[PDB]
Each structure stands twice: as C-alpha cells, then as structure tokens.
Amino acid sequence: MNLMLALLTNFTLATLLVIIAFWLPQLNVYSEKTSPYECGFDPMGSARLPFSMKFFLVAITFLLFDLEIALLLPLPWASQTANLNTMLTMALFLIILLAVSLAYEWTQKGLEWTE
C-alpha cells in the first residue's frame, strides 16, 4: 500500500507540473515556431531515416553479459551454503567464463566500432 501510494504521489506531482506548464502560460502558436530545429536551416531529410549503429556487435554482447548479473547477483546468498567448496568453484568458473568471453571478443577486434 505504501509503495503504491508513494509511486502515485511521485507521478501525480510530475503530471500536475506538466499540466500547469501547458495551461498557465500565454501561447502564440504558428507554423515556423513549431518546425524542427536544425541550427537555422531546414533539415535535409527526415529524422526517421535509418541511423547506422557502429557498436551493434557490442550491443548484442551487452545482452549476453547483462544476463551474467542475473546469475552473479545470487552470490551473497550462495556464500551462506554448507557446500562452500562446490559453491566457490562454480562461482569462480562462472566468472572466469564471463572473462574468457570478454577476452575472445577483445582479441578478435569485436569491441572496435565499425568504420
């Protein structure tokens, strides 16, 4: 109940501030005022055109490494077990394989952005 009421208050305050912003001030809207900004000259093309990602390979690798935090975050609880020898072995094995993945991509020029 408390958490939900705390969230409602934060996003209600955020919403009411936006509402005041649009209804309190005096507005004078015309075409040139709302045109897209490109430093003074009309944009040459649409902003919705394709935008090449030079770090696409590193972005895919982020998906795989971002799943290691899910597997690594239980470690504080894992250290409470009575099977410490097994737990410590698999904790280090899992982190090491995460490191070998980094080493492979680094050495194979995978972290270098495409020209």
């Binding site: 394709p50 696409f56 895919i60 690798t61 998906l63 795989l64 799943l67 899910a70």
Partner: protein, 98 residues
Amino acid sequence: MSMVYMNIMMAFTVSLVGLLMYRSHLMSSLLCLEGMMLSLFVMAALTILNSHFTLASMMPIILLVFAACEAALGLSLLVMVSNTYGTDYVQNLNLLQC
C-alpha cells in the same frame, strides 16, 4: 487454476498469434518471441512460487538466460538481413523457393 492463470495463458496465446502473423518487420516478430518468453517466465514463476518448490526457483532464471541467447542470435541475423537489403522486411527473404 486461479483467474491469474487465465490472463497469463492468454498473454502467451496473444504473443504466439502475434508471432505467426507477420506484417513486414522482422524486428516486430522478434519482439513477439521475447514476449512469449516473458509469459512462460511469469507462468513458471507463479507455479513454482505458489507450490513452494524451492529448488525450482532457479528455473525461471535459467529460462531468461537462454531467452537472451535466442534474442541476441535473432538480432545478429537481423543485422545481416539489413546489410543485404537495407531493410528488415521479410518479403525480401524469398530467394529460396519451396
């Protein structure tokens, strides 16, 4: 089988029907695969958490690990499709005839 299982199982069916009806974008279909994994994760987590199946509590995590591998794999193929045709449209993937 509480009323929550209805919506979760309906979410899976919606994402399955969404995956089997392509519009144009390969990326739009990839989202439906990630949507289906989300439904299975929620449905499995609910059953395991409700039955106090302690050791099964790691299964949903192992389900997300291999959902990322597939999602990353699907994105890698989407890069190569885009590099060959300039779009991710599925109608270009028709050089091979049945």
